[PDB]
Structures are given as C-alpha cells and as structure tokens.
C-alpha cells in the first residue's frame, strides 16, 4: 500500500502545481515596469563595529534600533551600542561554535545557537548585571541554525535535523513540535504579527509554519540551490530567500507563487544573508564574494552595493525603523551602512 | 555626558577582556575530530583528557589543542563543515580492522568526499588507524580473509620503504599498509595527509598530533614566504 500512497502524493503535488499555474497570470516585474525611481542609492558606511575575535555568523537588531547583538566563531556574543560603536555586553558562550544569535523584542533575552544542538537563552536584564544563561533549549538532534524570539517567554528554533520547533522559556520544553523538511533547515523568517513564520532548508523549499496550529500551512519550491537565509517582508504577505545559487527568491505567502527573482551574471557565489528595508523597498542581500549588493525589490534589480568587507558577508540586518543596515562578515568586522 | 563616557569605559573593559581571549585564541590550534561511529574516536578523547559538538582540550609542550568532535549530527549532509576553516588540521579516525557494504569502503568514500571538500582546501588531514590489536587477532588468526571478495590486495605486496615496527607478522603488515596506501591514494590524487598507525589506546597518539601540526603550519608558513 506504499505505491498507491506515492501515486496519490505525486498526483496531489502536480494538481497543486497546476493550481499554482492557473492562479499565476502575470509577473510582478511587468506590473511595476511603469515606474522606475530610486534607481541608484548611495549609503556610505560611516560606522564600523570592530572587536569581534573571529568570523561573525549572525547578528540581530534591537527593537530600540540603537542596540545590536552579534555572534562570532570563537564563541563570543557581543551586544553593541550601534549609535556610538560601543560594546554593551560580552557573553562568553559555553560552545565555541555558534551560527545564530537573536535579540528578544522586549530586549531582555538573547538567543544563541550553533553546533552544540542547543539554543541558549541569556538574560540581559537580570536582577544582577551579569548576562546569565536563563535557559538552555535542548531537544534538537542537528546543529541549531536559527532560533528567533517569538515573545519574551516563547521562541522558535531551526536546527540541522530538518526540524523546526517552538519552545517555552518558562518550562524549557519543545512545545508543538513540527517537521516537514527532508534536508536540514538553516534559517527561519518571523512575521511581525508573530503568528506565522517561514523557514528555508537544504530541501530548496521554504515552509510557512503557523505558530498556534503548529503545522505547515504552505510550501514554496523555486530555488536551484541550498537555501541559506530568509527574511519576511514587513507588509506581511511576502518574504525573500537567499541561496547558494546567487538568486534572491521573493515569494508571497498569498497565492502560492514566486513574486520575483533577483540575480545577475556578475554574482555567482552563494547568498548568506537577506533583509528588507523598513518599507521593503530595497532588498539587501549578503554574498560570499566580499560584497553586500543592495537590490531594489520594486525596481526588479540591484540598486546599490555595500562593499567594504574583506571576507564572506555572513549576516546583515535592517533595523526595525529602517534607519540603517548592519552587516557582519567573516573579516571579524561588522559594518553599519546608513 | 558622564553616562556616555561610562559607556566608553565599559566598552574599553570589554575590549580588554576581548584582547585577552584574543591572545588565548591566537595561542591555540583548533582541531576537528572526525570519523565513523564504530571507530575509536571516543577512546582517543579519553587519552586526550588523561550535545552536538564535543570541545575536548589537550596541551602538549605548552601548546593548546581544541579537538572538536561532532557527537549528534544528521550524518547525511555535511553543511556545518564550512564552519571549520581556521582549524589547523582535522583528525580523521578510522578502524582498520573491518574484517570481511563493508565499512572500509564507506570510510574511504567519506575520506574522499571530505578531502575533495572545497571548504577544507587549506586544511590538512592527519589520518589515524586504530584497531591494530583487533587487526592482529583477525589477520594473524586468519578466521576471516581479505581475498574473499577483494580482487586487489593479491597483486599488491609490502612496499620496500614500509617499516614494520611491531613486527607481529608479514601478513598483518601487508594488510595494514594496504589500508594505508588505499587511504592515501585519494590524498595523493596546499594540503597533506598524515597516515598513522595505532591501537585503541595510545599516549603517543597525542604526541603524534603535535608532530603533525608542527609540520603543517611550518609548511603553511614555508608556502606563505615562498620557501616551498
């Protein structure tokens, strides 16, 4: 009774793809071909946060738009004061291999995950001034690739065991576990409403997961290479994925399609980080070719370059108000571009 | 403004601590323990001492070594291997005595795949062969033969430069060096492969790593100064 199951699975998959094809009638590029402003944007650095020991893999902006967190290869979290290029905190990690860090929206906690299979929760604002590990999140059998904060006590994680997982900081237990990936999942993009989130995997198929119901609402194929990064559009209906095939794939959760692809002949390296502006007008993408090309989501093309890094651009983030964009690379330097 | 000047003073203290651990990191050579599950890697870390990542530490002649073993991983796709680029060398640990698919072929495939990995271009492998004893009670005993399903190993004999230090038996040495050059083919086909022979437990193994590293960086410097 397995052959019939495969038959039904592929039948419904192809009827899904036919439903998508019927739903899709026109592309987004030709919709917006009429207008073409902000064709060339200039954002000089003016801010370079130096002090990280080793290669930086992840960073996250604070909701206050002034405070930042970044993780380094040696196992060091640095809380930065972005406005004045200051170190706010220095957290030495138990595991010397971290590949994701996140900053709580409330500003009290920092999530930290890597090869240790754990997303460690550090409390920035304890009764004492010492950042302390308020809660280790264990239960993943693969390397933890991205754990973003849902709430002050509720968090979402993405690990190397093809399984994303919701967790409660109060109990530390994996709540409403959900897996739908065949290849391991490397990044998740959280919606502003904190009720949905989209995660990308080596399967080259993004998955939209509902927080409350806790199982896959929607799947998005379309990437010719491994997915490395994902950001969710501020409007709440779209999201962009950065990948090893040098293509930024912008899908929409509505209508189950790909809105656009952002690629060029010059770029052949992988895309390691992706973020959107405050209005989502610019798609800022990190590349393995020492460069952070600023693409224009609306203009269907690259509008600007954030070059100035001496190694692989591994992480970048646009602050909540969109005032500036931080960008971490492997040269141990994280530079803010305004 | 005194609050802001105190922001600077806290920044300076943090940066001083960061410089201290910068010196610590510079004075340390990172290693990546690698191998299969049936191998003796765990035994080795015990001699080193005497979640997902195991941060084993050991010091030899005032040289720190962080040998990192991946305990709980998917073992289907090695995408985290990109995170190891600064490692001095990656420890490849394989059980030589596979008896009579067979795990020698799987180990060879893993070694070839991790040798041809571009994330590890400037990375030298120091390969360890364990189960010298378990090879001894197999090849010398003769309960299981290697010629049963290997067409090769019959036209191959001990090389003239082979050094049988244990001297247990010519057959044992022949099989062991067949394993050695079977592994080294891939490496011979910027980086080096350092084959070593050992049993499950050995103190000299730790020293071996040091010696291997004392070559790698040296050459890495020789190539850096156009000396090699």
């Amino acid at each position, epitope marked *: 009774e397995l052959d019939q199951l495969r038959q039904e699975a592929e039948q419904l998959k192809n009827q899904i793809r036919d439903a998508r094809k019927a739903c899709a009638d026109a592309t987004l590029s030709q919709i917006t071909n009429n207008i073409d402003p902000v064709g060339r944007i200039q954002m000089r650095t003016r801010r370079t946060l130096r002090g990280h020991l080793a290669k930086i893999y992840a960073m996250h902006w604070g909701t206050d738009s002034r405070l930042l967190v970044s993780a380094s290869q040696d196992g060091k979290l640095i809380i930065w004061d972005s406005y004045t290029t200051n170190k706010v905190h220095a957290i030495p990690l138990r595991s010397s291999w971290v590949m994701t860090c996140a900053y709580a929206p409330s500003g009290n906690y920092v999530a930290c995950g890597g090869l240790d299979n754990i997303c460690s929760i550090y409390n920035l604002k304890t009764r004492e001034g010492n950042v302390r590990v308020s809660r280790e999140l264990a239960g993943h059998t693969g390397y933890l690739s991205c754990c973003r904060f849902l709430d002050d006590n509720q968090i979402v994680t993405s690990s190397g065991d093809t399984t994303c997982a919701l967790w409660d900081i109060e109990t530390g237990q994996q709540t409403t576990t959900f897996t739908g990936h065949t290849g391991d999942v490397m990044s998740l993009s959280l919606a502003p409403d904190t009720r949905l989130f989209v995660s990308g995997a080596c399967d080259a198929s993004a998955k939209l997961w509902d927080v409350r119901e806790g199982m896959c609402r929607q799947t998005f194929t379309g990437h010719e290479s491994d997915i490395n990064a994902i950001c969710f559009f501020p409007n709440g209906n779209a999201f962009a994925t950065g990948s090893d095939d040098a293509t930024c794939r912008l899908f929409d959760l509505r209508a189950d399609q790909e809105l656009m692809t952002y690629s060029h002949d010059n770029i052949i390296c992988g895309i390691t980080s992706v973020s959107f502006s405050k209005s989502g007008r610019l798609l800022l993408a990190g590349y393995d070719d020492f460069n952070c090309n600023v693409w224009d989501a609306l203009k269907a093309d690259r509008a600007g370059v954030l070059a100035g890094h001496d190694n692989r651009v591994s992480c970048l983030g646009v602050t909540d108000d969109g005032m500036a964009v931080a960008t971490g690379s492997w040269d141990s330097f994280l530079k803010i571009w305004n | 403004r005194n609050e802001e000047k105190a922001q600077r003073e*806290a920044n300076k203290k943090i940066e001083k601590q960061l410089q201290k651990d910068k010196q610590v990191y510079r004075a340390t050579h990172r290693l990546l323990l690698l191998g299969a599950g049936e191998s003796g890697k765990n035994t080795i870390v015990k001699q080193m001492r005497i979640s997902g990542i195991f941060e084993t530490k050991f010091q030899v002649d005032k040289v720190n070594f962080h040998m990192f073993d991946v305990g709980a991983q998917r073992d289907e796709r090695r995408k985290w291997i990109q995170c190891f680029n600064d490692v001095t060398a990656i420890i490849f640990v394989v059980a030589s005595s596979s008896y009579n698919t067979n795990r020698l072929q799987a180990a060879l495939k893993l070694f070839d795949s991790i040798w041809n990995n571009k994330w590890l271009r400037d990375t030298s492998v120091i390969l360890f062969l364990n189960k010298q004893d378990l090879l001894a009670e197999k090849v010398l005993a003769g309960k299981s033969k290697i010629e049963d399903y290997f067409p090769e190993f019959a036209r191959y004999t001990t090389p003239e430069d082979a050094t049988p230090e244990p001297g247990e038996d010519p057959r044992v040495t022949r099989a062991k060096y067949f394993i050695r050059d079977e592994f080294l083919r891939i490496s011979t086909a910027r980086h080096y492969c350092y084959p070593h022979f050992t049993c499950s437990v050995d103190t000299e193994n730790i020293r071996r790593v040091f010696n291997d590293c004392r070559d790698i960086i040296q050459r890495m410097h020789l190539r850096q100064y156009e000396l090699l």
Partner: single-chain antibody
Amino acid sequence: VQLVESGGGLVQPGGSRKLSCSASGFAFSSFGMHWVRQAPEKGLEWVAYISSGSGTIYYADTVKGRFTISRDDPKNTLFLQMTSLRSEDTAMYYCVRSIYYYGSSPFDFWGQGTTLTVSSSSDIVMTQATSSVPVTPGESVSISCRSSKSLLHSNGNTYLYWFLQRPGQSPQLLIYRMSNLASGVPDRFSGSGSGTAFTLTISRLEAEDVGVYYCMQHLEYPLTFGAGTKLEL
C-alpha cells in the same frame, strides 16, 4: 543582590576611618560605585565615585584629595579611607550601585548604610519646589524639580533621577532619565520634563508613598541633590 556596610561611629576630630561596603549575592566587577551619603537632617550628598575597572575616578569639590576609594573584585569589597575628620563630616553614608551600559538603570540599588558621629561655580544647582505637603490617598501627586541648566544633552538624554527614600532605610529608584520606570516600582509613576523644569506624577497613592523624594542630575558630575519633598499620611 545585597550590600552590607560596616564601620562608622564616634570619631574624635581629625580622625581617620575605613568604611567598608561588601557585596553579597552578586558581583560588582562591572558595576560603578557611587559614595552618596545621607545628611541626618538634610538632603543626600555625593563625595566619591569609582568606575567598574577603576579607569575613571571622581571626587567631590569639597573632598577631592582627602578621601580615598578602592575596590576589591576578588573580595567584592569597597573601601573608603577618610582622613582628618572634621565636625561637619557627619552623614548617613551609603554605597550605591550604578552600571552604565545603554538602557541600564543607574543608581538602582543602595546599601543598608552606616552612621558616623564626629565630635567638634561650575556646580549645577538642583532645586525642588517645596519640601513638605499633606497628601490624601488616591488623588494624583505632582512634584516639581528645577535645575540651573538644561539637562537635555545633545544625544537626547536628559539625565534625571528620582529615588523616593523612606526615612531611615535604603533608598530605592523610581525613574531614571526620561519616562523610564524601573520594573520593581509600580507603573503608576511617570516623569515629564520640558528641559529645565521637571515633574514627577503619581496617579494613585498608598502607604509606600510616605517619605521624602530626591532629585538628581548627571549632565556634568557634581551630583547635586534637590531639597526633597516629603509626603505624609
């Protein structure tokens, strides 16, 4: 987080005393220590200040080289050496914690305190409207504070602090800078400042509001204190 203070007592004029402030249950290695003393019948006063790493050390204008301040992180202790004790040098001394990372809560926690009985310009003027007023419960209470300069720094940080310490006990912290309320105190408190005149507003009142308030600035560093408004029930 506990602070235990030791030393003090009857001292002959011109004497030297080693006041001690030990930290128990927490580590002060990243904490700046401020030696704010309480006058027995007047407002609080600051004399000395040491940074977390002892990089920056400040003293009051009245006591610049007379006092000596040291911190021992391994022992988690603060030592205050005082020489040539005059009859005026009597106060209810307190050791104050204050960490200065962005968004922190300066002057959050105060020690138990010690008493010390002794025998016989550029400084900003920090003034409050009144000193005492009878208050009925429930109705909103407004306290006015004034400074001889504009506390709104170019970065936008108006350095003002309220403490509202009950008589004869460790001062607390109510609000710091602008419209920033410590999670320990109830949300009913609020602060409003034009830039030179400032108002502390209290929506509802209970038994905890009884006591004297205090107003501090931090733009420059003389740490001038206000007169102090007393609320009695």
